């Protein structure tokens, strides 16, 4: 549907999953993409150049910096809040396609503060596993609600093309269903490539999440909830 041109999506990380994700949304005629990544051109600029030719009608804004530094982080939040299709309005979705937990925690911290819905994606090191997850701050679990062991233990973080293509495809399908409101949106969709198992789940916020802005968005969510046969010549009988 042509209402797709009305939306803007930010993509963090234009590697394997993120670049396929960006191409798919460009071919769908998304109104605007924002691309964030950190390094000839930079990755975000090379991506922008190819995507512009695929669909000249899509608007692009790109940024080559590390969002996990203090000065760039505030800029990151500024563009989530005001870099929507109309300048001054937020983007309709953030997509996380980064390849470490620190950057996911940074996006999570930003979106919890802003009340910004995003989707997170991942692929396992050995390429036989991946997933997507929908994070509506306050309504579904944020990334800090269920931290991976290495994050919770404060330890330092010290076949690929097929799995990346599957994960990007299901990510963008979930984007389309969320934005255009058809079908059923998955709050979690896993991919086990070894056994072709695609578990769905719905992950819930922890009331004592470490991220205090997750907690505050949980309070606001609860407040908002509280506020409301052309023929048949044969004689076939359904029974």
């Amino acid at each position: 549907y042509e209402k797709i041109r009305t939306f803007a999506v930010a993509i963090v990380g234009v590697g394997g999953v993120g670049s396929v994700t960006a191409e798919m949304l460009t071919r769908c005629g998304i109104g605007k993409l924002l691309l964030f990544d950190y390094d000839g051109l930079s990755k975000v600029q090379a991506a922008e150049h190819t995507l512009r030719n695929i669909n000249p009608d899509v608007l692009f804004e790109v940024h080559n910096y590390n969002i996990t530094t203090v000065e760039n982080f505030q800029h990151f939040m500024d563009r989530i809040s005001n870099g929507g299709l109309e300048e001054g309005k937020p983007v309709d979705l953030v997509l996380s396609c980064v390849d470490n937990f620190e950057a996911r925690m940074t996006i999570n911290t930003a979106c919890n503060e802003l009340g910004q819905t995003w989707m997170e994606s991942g692929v396992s090191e050995n390429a036989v596993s991946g997933h997507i997850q929908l994070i509506i701050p306050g309504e579904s679990a944020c990334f800090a609600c269920a931290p991976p062991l290495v994050v919770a233990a404060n330890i330092d973080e010290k076949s690929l093309p097929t799995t990346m293509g599957v994960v990007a495809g299901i990510l963008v399908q979930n984007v389309l269903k969320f934005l255009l409101n058809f079908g059923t949106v998955s709050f979690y969709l896993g991919y086990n490539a070894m056994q072709d198992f695609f578990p769905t789940m719905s992950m819930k916020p922890n009331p004592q999440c470490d991220d205090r802005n997750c907690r505050k968005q949980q309070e606001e969510y609860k407040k908002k909830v509280a506020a409301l046969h052309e023929d048949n010549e044969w004689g076939i009988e359904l029974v």
């Binding site: 390849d99 609600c145 991976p148 062991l149 578990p199 922890n206 470490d210």
Partner: protein
């Protein structure tokens, strides 16, 4: 003191039953369960049967008191 931990990423939904002293940090329980399942401990996370996320950095006693016995490991795939 005791938990049944289910691996959500396997279609058979296998589980392990672990008995553990109250004072053990649950991070060690999550690591032990992941090792029994032969999945990577470092990227594993844990939720309740209802799907509520859990921060493993607390005692097994406190996890049991707050959430009971029935827990589920979910992968946290790290690449893009």
């Amino acid at each position: 003191v005791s938990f049944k931990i289910t691996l959500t990423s396997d279609p058979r939904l296998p589980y392990k039953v672990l008995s553990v002293p109250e004072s053990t940090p649950f991070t060690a329980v999550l690591k032990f369960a992941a090792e029994e399942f032969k999945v990577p401990a470092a990227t594993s996370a844990i939720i309740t049967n209802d799907g509520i996320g859990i921060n493993p950095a607390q005692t097994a006693g406190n996890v049991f008191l707050k959430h009971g016995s029935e827990l589920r490991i979910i992968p946290r795939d790290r690449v893009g």
